[PDB]
From a paper:
To determine the structural characteristics and differences between [name] isoforms, we solved the high-resolution structures of single-isotype skeletal muscle α-[name] (3.37 Å), cardiac muscle α-[name] (3.07 Å), ß-[name] (2.99 Å), and γ-[name] (3.38 Å) in the filamentous state using cryo-EM.
Specifically, we used our previously established Pick-ya [name] method to recombinantly produce human ß-[name] and γ-[name] in an engineered Pichia pastoris strain that expresses the human N-acetyl transferase NAA80 and histidine methyl transferase SETD3 to ensure uniform Nt-acetylation and methylation of H72/H73, a conserved PTM profile of vertebrate actins. For ß-[name] and γ-[name], we could resolve the entire N-terminus starting from amino acids D1 and E1, respectively. The acetylation site on the N-terminus is exposed on the filament surface and adds an additional negative charge to the already negatively charged N-terminus. Furthermore, we observed a cluster of positively charged amino acids (R661, R663, and R664) in loop-2 of NM2C that may interact with either the acetylated N-terminus of ß-[name] (D1Ac, D2, and D3) or the acetylated N-terminus of γ-[name] (E1Ac, E2, and E3) to stabilize the interface.
Residue numbers in the entry:
A (entry chain A), B (entry chain C), C (entry chain B), D (entry chain D): 1 to 374
The structure:
Amino acid sequence: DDDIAALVVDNGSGMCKAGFAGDDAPRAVFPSIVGRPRHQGVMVGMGQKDSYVGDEAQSKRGILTLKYPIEHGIVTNWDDMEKIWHHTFYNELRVAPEEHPVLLTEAPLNPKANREKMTQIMFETFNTPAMYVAIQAVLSLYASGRTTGIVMDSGDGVTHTVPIYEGYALPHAILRLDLAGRDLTDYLMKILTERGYSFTTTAEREIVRDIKEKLCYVALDFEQEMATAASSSSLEKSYELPDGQVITIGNERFRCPEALFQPSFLGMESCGIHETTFNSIMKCDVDIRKDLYANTVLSGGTTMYPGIADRMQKEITALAPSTMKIKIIAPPERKYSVWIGGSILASLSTFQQMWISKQEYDESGPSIVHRKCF
Amino acid sequence: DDDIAALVVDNGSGMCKAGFAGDDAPRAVFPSIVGRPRHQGVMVGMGQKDSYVGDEAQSKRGILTLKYPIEHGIVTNWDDMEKIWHHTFYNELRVAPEEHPVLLTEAPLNPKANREKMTQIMFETFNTPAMYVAIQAVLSLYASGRTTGIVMDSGDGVTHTVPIYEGYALPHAILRLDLAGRDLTDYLMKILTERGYSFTTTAEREIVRDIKEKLCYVALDFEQEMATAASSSSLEKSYELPDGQVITIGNERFRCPEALFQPSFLGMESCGIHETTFNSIMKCDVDIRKDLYANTVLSGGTTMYPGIADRMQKEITALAPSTMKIKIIAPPERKYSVWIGGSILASLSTFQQMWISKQEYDESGPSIVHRKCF
Amino acid sequence: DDDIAALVVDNGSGMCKAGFAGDDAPRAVFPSIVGRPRHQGVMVGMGQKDSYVGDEAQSKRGILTLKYPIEHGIVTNWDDMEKIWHHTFYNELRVAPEEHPVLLTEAPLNPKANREKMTQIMFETFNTPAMYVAIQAVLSLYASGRTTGIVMDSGDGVTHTVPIYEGYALPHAILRLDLAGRDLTDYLMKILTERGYSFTTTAEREIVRDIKEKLCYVALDFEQEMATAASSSSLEKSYELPDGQVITIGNERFRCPEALFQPSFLGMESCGIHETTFNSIMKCDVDIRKDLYANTVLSGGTTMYPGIADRMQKEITALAPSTMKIKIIAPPERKYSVWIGGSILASLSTFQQMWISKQEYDESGPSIVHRKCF
Amino acid sequence: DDDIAALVVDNGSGMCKAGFAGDDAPRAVFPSIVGRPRHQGVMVGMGQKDSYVGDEAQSKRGILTLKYPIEHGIVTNWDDMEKIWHHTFYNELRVAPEEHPVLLTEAPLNPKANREKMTQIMFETFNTPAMYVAIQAVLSLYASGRTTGIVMDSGDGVTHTVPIYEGYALPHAILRLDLAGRDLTDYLMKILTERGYSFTTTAEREIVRDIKEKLCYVALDFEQEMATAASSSSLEKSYELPDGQVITIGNERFRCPEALFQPSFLGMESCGIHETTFNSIMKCDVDIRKDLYANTVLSGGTTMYPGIADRMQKEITALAPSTMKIKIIAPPERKYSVWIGGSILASLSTFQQMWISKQEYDESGPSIVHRKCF
Ligand SMILES: Nc1ncnc2c1ncn2[C@@H]1O[C@H](COP(=O)(O)OP(=O)(O)O)[C@@H](O)[C@H]1O
Ligand SMILES: Nc1ncnc2c1ncn2[C@@H]1O[C@H](COP(=O)(O)OP(=O)(O)O)[C@@H](O)[C@H]1O
Ligand SMILES: Nc1ncnc2c1ncn2[C@@H]1O[C@H](COP(=O)(O)OP(=O)(O)O)[C@@H](O)[C@H]1O
Ligand SMILES: Nc1ncnc2c1ncn2[C@@H]1O[C@H](COP(=O)(O)OP(=O)(O)O)[C@@H](O)[C@H]1O
Ligand SMILES: [Mg+2]
Ligand SMILES: [Mg+2]
Ligand SMILES: [Mg+2]
Ligand SMILES: [Mg+2]
């Protein structure tokens, strides 16, 4: 199938994941950022470009201002998005996006103008023969290898759930939540100031993100952990900064991820992640709820904290009735489960009849996308 | 007689009963329902059919809308009936309906178009060599082993009686009644709302039907039972739903089956089951009434409530004169007595001359059925 | 009759309506909500209470979480209900509920524990000399001035019908439906997200409710309206939210009220409002159906959409036979017809003998209500 | 004669006929029914009575249960009969039954207790100065204007014949028959079910009675009519029910009245109407039979079917010898011939000496009636 070799490209709120259908791991993973210089140059003939995309911006991050083209899964800057797509197709995968149909992903309940503009850029700036837009949670269930269960996806901008029974989706039970990794990073920056550490710039935000994902964990019991931390001092680890200085973090290690289960720490009116998952189940039919309780799939980077699965099981068992058995299925490769399911779907023989052709778009205007792709 | 092996197939308002002549129990019993999907599928290549018949629909009943092809013993949907017959003949009995003559049953006082269409489907869609239509109450008396007595049959849609003296039927004394299991199920659903339990969907109707047939009974004295139930609390049982919740039922246990003897609870103008049985006897000749009083046969699923026979004896003795002796004959296998009598009749040597041939139908149009079969 | 001056107090799923018998309009109408603070106070001596009831909660709705004490006509919080009753009797009507008998209303087919607890609170917390519970649909027919016809009532939680012939009720024909204003509000919130507007909090729900009741209408023909809306742009209106921002609504103006006639939009198994009204008529006797077809009374807030009466007439004429004449009677004051009928009934001279006395709930108890009041 | 103004009141099994002697037509004709409410009233002060008599019951027949006080010419309910007599004397004729002697009618071969109780009610509850009981068939011959011939009377409960020669009655030749309009109505209801129309309630019985008397007729040759009806479709008429529906009747138009000549359709052992009339003639003397063959008088409502006279002539000619001439005398006003003859008899000058006085009853107990009035 080289001819098609569907270039499976995912663009998560925080990262970009591209590759080829049939493989078991993404070829390219890099941050979705665009940087621009903020000082005046004195060296002449240095070959200073006007923009840097991806890992190059993270390297020389001390002299640029970094901007995220995507906020909360909604595009706000379209010039920056075109720059990122050009980087992925030419300088990273080094392929020609004119003979490979492309499969894209999108969160549920997005504005319709998003998919209209996605199709227009792909068919006009590039000449891709076909395209299809799929819900990211459905692709996660493909990777899990099962056709029954409620899926949780939490990336960098959005958190959504969708339960589907024997291949049948219940669109009235889909719930969305605007709590993800970026809110946790801002909260950790705010609460690190009690010990005297002040991080304000965008470059300092990247430093704080690294600290969070290497030293934080979810506590099984929140109140009891505080008493142990207050009494002794064994719950302390040291981190060295990019310039060589040392910081020590105590109860902030588990106080930051706790915001997922108690959103009132940030002052937003919303339910916790455990209650949202339970609320989606209770919106389904009576006769299918038992199979949903025993098939729960976790996905996304924000679900990779240590000890999250045990805490989730404890909370849901307290909510659900005693007789039912609750099982949380968190495979070790759940960080890339969305991409894995996309490759499997594009390699199916029966899927080849649902591509959107170039001819159909030319005759009927850029709306076919809303009715098509289900 | 394998050659004939009459495929004895009964199609009661609620259930379907098929098998072979000469056996003592039906081979296949399953609900007479057809289900169709009501959501939109997202999983591809799942092998999702467009219709489910029988036990398959009851399994996955949480995503379909269930329809009954038969209401009150009168056919309303003919495509669904053809689907059910195809299921029984091929996927359940796994026989070829081309060399076995078929015996069907029908309630008295039905529209004539019913038997005309039954014959046309059997002779055109299938190629059955012969067929015969028998009254279900007559077959019940065959199973009882006697040729004198008044038979009561109450299934899911209709209730009828027919008294026959020494092999002679009195067609002027046949009485019909539109009160059966479905009316009781609707009444129980309506009266369960006083305690806060709300069942509305068709799937919830199946749940309510199971509750009714496992926890309900007929009270010997209606007024006295209410005083005992009001005073104490020993008349209470617990039931667990399909999803782990628990309901408690008090006086609703015996208030639901009571509607058979007092039809005014549903607001319909009609007599009770005891008065209907007595009314049929008084329409017969004087000299045969004494043998009818001492030979009463009960049949059908709705007559399977505990304590129904004792209550029936008490009511009829109060109506009939003191000198006569009233005996109610309710064998333990009366749930299948209609099917049992059909097998016995089809295995009789003297019955083989009354089959309707294929040749007679072809020459004389589909009306022979009305004059034939008595 | 000042002495009695029956305090006519109605408590609809969404609003509360109180006043005095003999008047032509309710004195007090205000939302049935209770609010509680959700932030921590820093100003000292501000006189900050712990709860707000009614219009005070709607004023300062930006810092509280609002809860509805009534869901689907069934009480769930009893402390909040006592708070609301205290507000109405003292701070709004400014009367003493000890010398005026009180008339309350209730939807049919409610749990019996509801009226038991209503009587206990009124006779113990307050010392009201007498009380009576009436069906809201019967009171609506009193206001219409006629004693023949089928009444439709649709408020905020329930929709019910009850046909009554010459003062005789047919309790076997009463039908209930759980589709009202709250389901429409949730659906409009869900379907407003396609244009990018996201309302999630409870305060944002009140904003969405105002938009719905000032810019929505029922289309005479659903399919044809979509073609006109797709082609031109004249079907668009602007609304200005509380911070100065403006939103534009297109086909969502008539897509929201359409859910009443096609309940499958919300994914619930039920019939439309037109089919429910027709189904109730066909459950009545043959000889009284002709007078019911020409006497149809609409009531409740949800029936106040523009163009609802014309659409209802078209649907029922297509269902009913051609010879009958269908007339829909929708008076301009049908928003308060339930309250109007209650005042008329309490002012009748022949009604004074059916009050429930105080000595009877001390010689009988709070169950007298089930047998009494019909 | 105003003073006497004999209030000629007839009470046929089905209808009541009252008026004044000397007139040529009854003043009041209305059904002999009593209705009672069967539902519970909610409207207060509606002036709902506990019983309705006559045309008022037929108007509001959709909410009552109707009972006939008379079955087969024998009184069974005496409270209902007193109610009907009170209605006729006060609310319809508006006269005082204390100064007008009353003439009543009765079928032959009734129980003696009937006339004993009739006299007691009239002399005690009312104070009528005089009474007389006459055979209805004798009064029919008075209206015909002849004193020779055999009279046939068929009303709603009984059919009787009595031949009288030159003013001399032959009481040994009187024959009675229990086949009248009510049996025909029940048979039509039973045989209408073959086309799918189900009428069961008492109100539905009145609908069926109207259909029978407006679309039924007697066929001259029964077998030949069936062949014509089977072949073509011109023998079909349409009728519109009260709620808008439309029913079509084919061979049931003449199959219902045929039961008069072939009583075996209802399964009763009896002779046909033609054979009963012939049997009465053959029980008379030889020398008076010739004048009886040429003087046959028909009377009653059941004899009003079209084509009955021609069929009767054909059957009797086949039975009687060829030389005799058979003439059937059916005047156009034979529906009221019994009442007409009663007025003529009460206006005769020579009849005034045969009244039963009030004084004779007081001295000699209520038996004088059996020996008196012949
Ligand atoms: N080891 C880890 N521990 C905790 N959080 C992590 C870890 N690795 C990644 N994350 C979180 O996952 C997020 C990245 O999600 P990503 O896979 O980019 O989602 P998407 O591709 O949909 O944008 C980061 O914001 C980071 O906070
Ligand atoms: N154990 C039981 N207790 C009470 N009711 C029962 C029981 N078993 C069956 N029934 C009733 O009998 C009905 C089934 O009747 P069925 O035998 O199908 O009649 P038919 O074959 O004529 O349709 C069901 O509707 C059910 O309500
Ligand atoms: N002008 C309007 N247009 C559309 N909907 C309205 C309008 N006015 C009121 N409503 C709806 O009617 C409902 C109020 O019903 P209400 O009269 O309180 O019933 P009840 O008294 O039984 O609670 C509100 O939820 C609102 O959505
Ligand atoms: N036009 C008609 N065709 C057929 N039957 C009729 C017609 N008119 C009246 N009848 C029958 O005659 C009966 C009325 O008989 P009626 O004169 O009341 O006898 P009586 O006065 O002795 O009760 C009704 O039951 C009805 O069935
Ligand atoms: Mg993700
Ligand atoms: Mg049965
Ligand atoms: Mg209302
Ligand atoms: Mg008569």
